[PDB]
């Protein structure tokens, strides 16, 4: 999930279908 | 189970965007509009 690079070059990372617990600020989603 | 059968072989199932609570939260706006208004609320405001 990112905006443009022209905006920011920040990005966050949504693993799907994956427990939050189980992954190699954090949220858990459906 | 099939499902992770097919969940195994990388075939798999997305969420829908929205929620069937807020599908029915947009039925009910859609019936209150309705019954308390007519038309009226589809052609302009309440
Ligand atoms: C994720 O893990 C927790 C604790 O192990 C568990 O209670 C929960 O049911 C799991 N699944 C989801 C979707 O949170």
Do not use: H
């Amino acid at each position: 999930i990112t905006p443009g690079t022209n905006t920011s070059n920040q990005v966050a990372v949504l693993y799907q279908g994956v427990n939050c617990t189980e992954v190699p600020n954090v949220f858990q989603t459906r | 189970d099939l499902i992770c059968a097919q969940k195994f072989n990388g075939l798999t199932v997305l969420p829908p965007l929205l929620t069937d609570e807020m599908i029915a939260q947009y039925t009910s706006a859609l019936l209150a509009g309705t019954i308390t208004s007519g038309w009226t609320f589809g052609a302009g405001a309440a």
